[model samples]
Target: LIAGQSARAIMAQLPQEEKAKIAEQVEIFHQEKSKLDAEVAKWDDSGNDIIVLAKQMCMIMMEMTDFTRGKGPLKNTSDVINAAKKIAEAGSRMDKLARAVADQCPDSACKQDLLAYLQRIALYCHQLNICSKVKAEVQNLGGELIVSGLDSATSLIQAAKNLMNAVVLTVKASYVASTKYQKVYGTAAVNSPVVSWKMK
Candidate 1:
């Protein structure tokens, strides 16, 4: 959704062991992201001070990627790229909706976070567009800003969900390829009709 195909292309180059690693990262990020989102859902706009609520949520989203990288099951480029794209989409959506609630938001905490998230999104988009030295900068800023812990679950969850979704999309593309199980035996092995027998 964030324009360009660098993520998918890069992932395609990774070896199967690396691909499996990517899948693990996707699932780990998926769990962390979901947990944070649940926290945000609990807020009642009518009773809570809008800015405080927004700030609280924004903090979480701003740093939700801590569990998704660095020497873990989820640590890798596939995980990072997927997470970044997801963060960009979520931040973009929230930024738009948060603006709609501008009047209700007594202060601009959510707005500020939304803008910061948007900045992150722009960096990611640029990385996707250029796919060169600039990407290192984008990836670094992403981890620094969006990775958080349990205390910041809500927004972090938001960011994780976005990233997980992106990784999921990358995984989806692989379904089109043939698997070893589906491949026909070589010409020598398949020459005999006996190989076609099925179990009862």
Candidate 2:
């Protein structure tokens, strides 16, 4: 009970002030939602996943933003790729952890959190898509930056392919999880006479 009303019930009957706040929240929600939807659509069309698209988007954003602002420390392809690789590695780790939890957790609360975390990743991937699209616009306006004997187009396809592979690979474990803890652990040892999983 918050201020004499249950938060859920209070939200159900929004006053004008509450309505305004709710409106803003809803707008952000849908905007993020649309971005996420478009990202998933891109994956469906290109056979990639949101995580892969995110890394691609981040790379482009970093390079374009730095070039335009004259603030990027590294002025080389290798540096940009390295920076993007770090970000991609983090995303990959998150995906791996989430998949592991989603596969192993029997607790409802943990599973719910894991699912929400996955959806949030999917949403952020969409925002990254928007950033990449903006990077394209900026490039078009600023004219394509020159590099020594390097073609962005060919590399773009390869990078996208690599990221998509990562996304596809990230979900592999959850695909085969059968929730057979007993089979894996053996029924006698699962309980023994003492050690409860104590989860639920």
Candidate 3:
């Protein structure tokens, strides 16, 4: 029970507990990033820019997470909010491209998987947008100031991680959809792969 004091005063006296929890969350995101990199590297970017979109989403996610720890290029709530916008833009681009892949696939299974992954991407991107705009709140109780943002910070990180995984799966699913119709149905889908997947 704290109150009346300035937010700055409350923060200066707060626990390091939130900091360590966010740091752990950031570490797990790094591992997710590695997986995204390896998966994206398997594809060629020349035919399509989906890889570029995926990486842009990832970069923004990293910046938002960094902001939570009072680190990274994002200096304040405004910067973090802008980062969410950028990520959402990236998500739309990926959505359009992956939807094209889905439309091209004649196989229902491949088409369904590609479509589903895009849905997850959209969902997680919205979650990140919601999470990023929330700043740590300082409350006054019994005339002493109290700072609390543990829930907000962790939610932002988890949204980013889920978004990252969605992007990764979308990358692979798009590739699978690109190959499926050609092997099974054998038609125009074989002629157009909207995106290229080359060994790298």
Candidate 4:
């Protein structure tokens, strides 16, 4: 509780220009946030791999954005960096699961679409990793450390926004591909629940 107060106090001292920059990035973040919310809402969560991945990514991303505002589980820049790595790992797993479906997919259009979305996921993950390496700017003010991370915070938010958009597309495409394959072949085509493969 006190930490939240402290965060607010620190932000209150930010330069107006810096605050404006963050506000702009925040607009972008909220736009993508709504997109993710809408995409994740369409699933049944009955062990669908894409839905599970989308949920995990959403949770991690919220924590990451909260960290930028000094209001989340992440306590430092290193923690945020690690969070980005986890996103990448999850993205790789998502790619593999979606690719498996694509390989066995009978509908060329659905297969190609899923493959394209997987590529977008991979690309966004790479971008997120690069942008989430945020650093705090420590300033000695009246013998107190006035730390700020506005620049990195905005950059991180932008990266997260882009990644979230890509994730939304990936989830939608995965669902289409899964249903397409199941429609042509029986539900036993994959012999396992689609997107339910155990992650490594």
Best by lDDT: 3
Better model by lDDT: candidate 2 vs candidate 4: 4
lDDT of 3 by residue, 1-200 (tens): 65524322332334598777778888998899899989877767777688889888888887777777765677667777788989999899889989988887888988998888899999999988888864668788799997777687788889999999999999988888877856665544436567777666
Per-candidate TM-scores read 0.30, 0.30, 0.84, 0.79
Tell me each candidate's RMSD, in Å, in order: 22.8, 18.1, 4.8, 5.2
TM-score of candidate 3 on Cα atoms, chains taken together: 0.84
Backbone clashes (count) for model 4: 0
> How well is each residue in 37-57 modelled by candidate 2, as lDDT tens digits?
444443332322333444444
TM-score of 4: 0.79
- Ranking of candidates on lDDT, top first: 3, 4, 2, 1
Count clashing residue pairs per candidate. Answer: 15, 0, 5, 0
Relative to the true structure, candidate 2 reaches a TM of 0.30
Error of 3 at 36 (Å): 0.4
lDDT of 1 by residue, 99-138 (tens): 3333232234533443444445444444432221111112
Q: lDDT (CA) for every model shown?
A: 0.36, 0.39, 0.80, 0.76
| Candidate 2 vs candidate 3, TM-score winner | 3
